C-alpha cells in the first residue's frame, strides 16, 4: 500500500532528524566566537575583459590560473588571457543557447552545453591549430546546466531532467547515471580528490554522490527555495549552497547537518553563484541586485562588496592559487578582482 | 624571446577581434523570436507555415520578410517546468504566444494559458520583453460556439454580463456570438497585460487561423513596432 510506504518514509525522516539533533553539541558561531574578525576588505577591478555580445552564463578558470573560458548566449566560447587581456581563442558554437562551460584540468579540452541537450567537447590542441569538435554527448533529455571534467577522458554533466550523468568521452556512452533528484539539477562541484561530487537541484536539496559506485550518499536540506549555486569547501569536508531565498548556507559531510547560514536583512534577492577563497575563510557569493558580497565563512559577518556590475551576476570563480577573483554578468563584461 | 610571444599573442587577439567585429553585424541585424504555447495550440502548424514559405532540445527556424531575417526558436524536448530555462529568453525581440482556444469543454486549457501568460508578464527578467499573441484558434471557435459545444459561459461567469466593445469590428458575415466570445477571449489577455506593463513591454493581441498565410507579415509589423518603440524610449521621446 502506498499509504504504508509514506508512513515508513516519514518515520525514517523523523529518525534522521532525531539523529542530526543529537549531534548538535554547539553552533559554529559559539565555537568561533573568540576569533578575530577578518576586517573590511576592499577589492578593486584589476582587469575588465570585454568582447562578448550577449549575456554571459558561465566561465571557468584554467588550472594554471592564467587562462579562462567564457560562454555567452550569443554562441561563442572565448578563451581569455587574464594577465594580458588578449583573447587567445574564439570558438563559434553550433547552438546559440549555451548556458555552461568547463576547462579541462590538463587544459587540452573545453566543453559547453545548453538548451540543446547535446554536450560538446572541443579540442584546443589540434594539429592544424583550429578548434574542432572532438565528441558530442547526446544522451540527455533536458537542458544541460553544468559540466565538470574529471580528466581528459571522463566528464560529469548535470541536466534539467533531474539526473546527473557520468560520461566517457572516447566512447561517448554513459558510464553511470545518477537518478536521485526530483527537480532540475543546475549546479555541481567535484571534491578536491574527485572521489565525490555534490549537486543542488532546484528543490532545496543537495546530494552527495559517489562517482565510482554511483549512488547518492547523503542528502542535505535546510533551504527554502531553489538551489542554483554550489561549491565544495577547500578542505573537502563542507560545501556552501546558493539559493533563491537570498541566503547562503554552509553544510558538512561528516556531521550530515547544517552548521551556519549567511543572510542579511537588506538582501532579498537570491544567490546566483558561490565560491571560496584559498584558505576558506571567505565565502564570496554572487547576488542578484548586481553585487557580490564577501562573507566571513567563520563568523558569518559580511566583509566587503564587489560592486561594479551593471546587470545580474551569473558566474564567479576564484583562481586555483587564490590570487584573483573573476565575475561574469548579463552585461557581457568579466572583471578580475583582487 | 618573451617579446616575440607577446607580439604573436597581440596578433592573434587582433585576428579574433576582427572576426568578432564581422560576427557582430549579423547578430545585431537578426531578430530572435521565441515561439511558445501548448501542444493543442497548433504552434506546430505555425512552424510548418514558416517552413513551407522558406529529438533535439530546441529547434531553430529562420525566415525572412522583406529582406529582414528572423530567428524562431521552438522548444521540443524540455520538461514542463519552465521557471529556469525561460530566463535565457530575456533578450529576445518578442515572445510569440499561441493560445489553444476552443480546445476544451486539462479541465480548462484557456485558464492554463492565461496563468502562463500572466507568469510570463510578471517575471522580473522577462519584464522588458514584449509578448506577441496570435489567437490561432478562431475558425474552430465559430463552429464550437454556434453549436454550443464550446459553452464558454459556464467556465467564465464574466460572459453573462460582458458587452462587445465599441471598437470591435466583426469580420464580414461573422455571427454576433462568435465575435463576442472571440473579443472576450482577447479582453481577458488584455486585462492581464494592462497591469504591470507601464512603458516597459507591450502585448499585441491578434485573431488568426492555423491556415493563415500572413502570420509572417503580422510578426514583422509587430517586431517593427517593438523596435521603433524601444528606439523612441531610449531618447525619452515616449
Amino acid at each position, epitope marked *: 500500500e502506498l499509504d504504508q510506504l509514506r508512513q515508513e518514509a516519514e518515520q525514517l525522516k523523523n529518525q534522521i532528524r532525531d539523529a542530526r539533533k543529537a549531534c548538535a553539541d554547539a553552533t559554529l558561531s559559539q565555537i568561533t566566537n573568540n576569533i578575530d574578525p577578518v576586517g573590511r576588505i576592499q577589492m578593486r577591478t584589476r582587469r575588465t575583459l570585454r568582447g562578448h555580445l550577449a549575456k554571459i552564463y558561465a566561465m571557468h578558470w584554467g588550472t594554471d590560473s592564467r587562462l579562462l573560458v567564457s560562454a555567452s548566449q550569443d554562441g561563442k566560447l572565448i578563451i581569455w588571457d587574464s594577465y594580458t587581456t588578449n583573447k587567445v581563442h574564439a570558438i563559434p558554437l553550433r547552438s546559440s543557447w549555451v548556458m555552461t562551460c568547463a576547462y579541462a584540468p590538463s587544459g587540452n579540452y573545453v566543453a559547453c552545453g545548453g538548451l540543446d541537450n547535446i554536450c560538446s567537447i572541443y579540442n584546443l590542441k589540434t594539429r592544424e591549430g583550429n578548434v574542432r569538435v572532438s565528441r558530442e554527448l547526446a544522451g540527455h533529455t533536458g537542458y544541460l546546466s553544468c559540466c565538470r571534467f574529471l580528466d581528459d577522458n571522463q566528464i560529469v554533466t548535470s541536466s534539467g531532467d533531474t539526473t546527473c550523468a557520468l560520461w566517457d568521452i572516447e566512447t561517448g556512452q554513459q558510464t553511470t547515471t545518477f537518478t536521485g533528484h526530483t527537480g532540475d539539477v543546475m549546479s555541481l562541484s567535484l571534491a578536491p580528490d574527485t572521489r565525490l561530487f555534490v549537486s543542488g537541484a532546484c528543490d532545496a536539496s543537495a546530494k552527495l554522490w559517489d562517482v565510482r559506485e554511483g549512488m547518492c550518499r547523503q542528502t542535505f536540506t535546510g533551504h527554502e527555495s531553489d538551489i542554483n549555486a554550489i561549491c565544495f569547501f577547500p578542505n573537502g569536508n563542507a560545501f556552501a549552497t546558493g539559493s533563491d531565498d537570498a541566503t547562503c548556507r554552509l553544510f558538512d559531510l561528516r556531521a550530515d547537518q547544517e552548521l551556519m547560514t549567511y543572510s542579511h536583512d537588506n538582501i532579498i534577492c537570491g544567490i546566483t553563484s558561490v565560491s571560496f577563497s584559498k584558505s576558506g575563510r571567505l565565502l564570496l557569493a554572487g547576488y542578484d541586485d548586481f553585487n557580490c558580497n564577501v562573507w566571513d565563512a567563520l563568523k558569518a559577518d559580511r566583509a566587503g562588496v564587489l560592486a561594479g556590475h551593471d546587470n545580474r551576476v551569473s558566474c564567479l570563480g576564484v583562481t586555483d592559487d587564490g590570487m584573483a577573483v573573476a565575475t561574469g554578468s548579463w552585461d557581457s563584461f568579466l572583471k578580475i578582482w583582487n | 624571446d618573451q617579446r616575440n610571444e607577446e607580439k604573436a599573442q597581440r596578433e592573434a587577439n587582433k585576428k579574433i577581434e576582427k572576426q568578432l567585429q564581422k560576427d557582430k553585424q549579423v547578430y545585431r541585424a537578426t531578430h530572435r523570436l521565441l515561439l511558445l504555447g501548448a501542444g493543442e495550440s497548433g504552434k506546430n502548424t505555425i512552424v510548418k507555415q514558416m517552413r513551407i514559405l522558406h529529438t533535439s532540445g530546441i529547434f531553430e527556424t529562420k525566415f525572412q520578410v522583406d529582406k529582414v531575417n528572423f530567428h524562431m526558436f521552438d522548444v521540443g524536448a524540455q520538461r514542463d517546468e519552465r521557471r529556469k530555462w525561460i530566463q535565457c529568453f530575456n533578450d529576445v525581440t518578442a515572445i510569440i504566444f499561441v493560445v489553444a482556444s476552443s480546445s476544451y469543454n486539462q479541465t480548462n486549457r484557456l485558464q492554463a494559458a492565461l496563468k502562463l501568460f500572466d507568469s510570463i508578464w510578471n517575471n522580473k527578467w522577462l519584464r522588458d520583453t514584449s509578448v506577441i499573441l496570435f489567437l490561432n484558434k478562431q475558425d474552430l471557435l465559430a463552429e464550437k460556439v454556434l453549436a454550443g459545444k464550446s459553452k464558454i459561459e459556464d467556465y467564465f461567469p*464574466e460572459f453573462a454580463r460582458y458587452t462587445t466593445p465599441e471598437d470591435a469590428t466583426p469580420e464580414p458575415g461573422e455571427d454576433p456570438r462568435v465575435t463576442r466570445a472571440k473579443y472576450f477571449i482577447r479582453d481577458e489577455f488584455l486585462r492581464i497585460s494592462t497591469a504591470s506593463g507601464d512603458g516597459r513591454h507591450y502585448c499585441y493581441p491578434h485573431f488568426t487561423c492555423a491556415v493563415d498565410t500572413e502570420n509572417i507579415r503580422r510578426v514583422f509589423n509587430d517586431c517593427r513596432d517593438i523596435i521603433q518603440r524601444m528606439h523612441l524610449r531610449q531618447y525619452e521621446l515616449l
Partner: nanobody
Amino acid sequence: QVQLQESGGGLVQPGGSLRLSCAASGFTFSNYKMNWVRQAPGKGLEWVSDISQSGASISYTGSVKGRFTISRDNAKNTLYLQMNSLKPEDTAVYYCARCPAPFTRDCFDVTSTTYAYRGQGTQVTV
C-alpha cells in the same frame, strides 16, 4: 524541508460544504504566495485559486467563482479554503502549491506534474 500537509477533505453530498486546511512548516509562511491546485480523475492538474503575501489580492478559477473562499493565517502558518455549494464535478485531489520564490508575484510551474514544493493532496469526493 519544505513540507505542506493538507487536511479536511472527505465525502460530502452535493450542495454541502467542506473546509480544506493546509499546514506549512520549514519556511517563512508570510513571504511566499500560496495557491490551490486540483486534479480531476482522468484529467490534468487544474489551478483553483491563490492569494498574495498579505492576502490583499485574491483570484479564483472561473468554475468556482463565488462558491469557494481562500484565506491565510500568517501568524499560525496555515492556509484555508472554504468550499460551499459543492458539485459532483468538484471531485478531485486537492493539492496545496507554493510559489517557487519568496518575493516574486510570478507563480511559475505550480500545476506541473512534478512540482517540488507541492503537498501530497487530499481526496475530496462529492
